[PDB]
Amino acid sequence: NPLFSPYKMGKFNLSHRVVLAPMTRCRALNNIPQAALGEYYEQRATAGGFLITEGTMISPTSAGFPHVPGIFTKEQVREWKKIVDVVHAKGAVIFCQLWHVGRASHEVYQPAGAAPISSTEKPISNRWRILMPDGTHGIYPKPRAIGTYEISQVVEDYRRSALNAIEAGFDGIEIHGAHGYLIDQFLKDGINDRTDEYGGSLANRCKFITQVVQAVVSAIGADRVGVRVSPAIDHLDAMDSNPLSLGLAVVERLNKIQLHSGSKLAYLHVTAARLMRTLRNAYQGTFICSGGYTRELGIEAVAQGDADLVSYGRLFISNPDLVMRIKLNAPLNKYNRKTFYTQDPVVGYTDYPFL
């Protein structure tokens, strides 16, 4: 089983290649990490195993879900440190995913009910609805297209959040540039209708993610920085006319950032020759594949060299010992979609049984 051959992910030595994918669970009440999160990640932590936390707010305007953790206040760093210690006390490596939803927000999630910010003024179409704090579903509003000065301010929010994560004890961070959120709103030409230096050509549309990665790399180091993208996922109207060309353009800038920094990024994380094999071959460094992978598909991806690590999402919600179950080829538990985003600290969160 190649999933349990060790792997060197920069400075971190992993004992297996099963990774916990980032998953918003909405148990961080009032954007403050709770003790339930520490129990949740501890259940899933393994000695030498890699964990990626739920998307974490970088600023008061970055949230589009209820009760998602932040890492932009000192109270948030204080609470995150207790969760990181418990995870580290089981021998695991943990990255904090920095997450800005962009236009994928709503009045109720914004300070003073302000409009969400984005690369464009176009809202997410009527086909998608946002989850509201009371469990209902609302309408995505018109975002406010930000200028270039505000862009550099959002980049500074990524930078300050990356330092706060290291302050909390995180081994590193992952840049959330997937699933049609703020960074994807600049990447995809189905959303980015700008005419300034951040829109139009592939180079202009890759400029925002390039500045975000360079800023956090300069702050904490490249080997503590992971990047996640999803060129071929159309979530929230995040379509590109050429997802392969866009994905290869992003890899080219990531490869260049590593050359200009003298170090490799922690990894490239792609969720969805296959599109995934093409980006892996083009990227000079560690590759994590994500999306619909099983035990056999993950074994095969590592054996054929398609990826170095495999992240599992939904199966990790219902199987806290998913790493052990994959090792023993033990039957897995079903997950309950109803409690994906509820607020109970136990029900549908930490009460999924171990083997």
Please identify every residue annotated as catalytic.
Answer: 181
> What is the DSSP-derived secondary structure letter of residue 70?
B
Question: SS in 3 state form for 139-199?
Answer: ECCCCEECCHHHHHHHHHHHHHHHHHHHHCCCCEEEEEECCCCHHHHHHCCCCCCCCCCCC
Nearer to ligand FMN, 28 or 93 (CB): 28
Q: Are 45 and 197 a contacting pair, CB within 8 Å?
A: no
Taking residues 279 to 298 in sequence order and writing x for each that binds ligand FMN by CB under 6 A, - otherwise, the string is -----------xxxx-----
Does 325 help bind ligand FMN (rule: CB under 6 A)? no
Taking residues 152 to 191 in sequence order and writing x for each that binds ligand FMN by CB under 6 A, - otherwise, the string is ------------------------x-xx------------
Nearer to ligand FMN, 95 or 312 (CB): 312
For ligand FMN (CB under 6 A), the number of binding residues is: 21
Q: Which of 27, 38, 46, 54 binds ligand FMN (CB under 6 A)?
A: 54
Nearer to ligand FMN, 140 or 312 (CB): 312
CA pair distance 105, 129, nearest whole angstrom: 10
Q: Which of 90, 142, 277, 314 binds ligand FMN (CB under 6 A)?
A: 314
Known binding residue 97? Answer is yes
Tell the burial category of 279 from Cβ atoms under 10 Å away from its Cβ (0-12, 13-18, 19+). buried
Nearer to ligand FMN, 104 or 154 (CB): 104
Chain centroid to Cα 250, Å, comes to 16
Pairing of strands 137-139, 129-131: antiparallel
CA pair distance 212, 90, nearest whole angstrom: 31
Could you say which residues in the range 205-234 bind ligand FMN, by CB under 6 A? 228
Q: Which of 21, 222, 302, 309 binds ligand FMN (CB under 6 A)?
A: 21
Contact residues toward ligand FMN (CB under 6 A) are: 21-24, 54-55, 97, 176, 178-179, 228, 271, 290-293, 312-315, 340
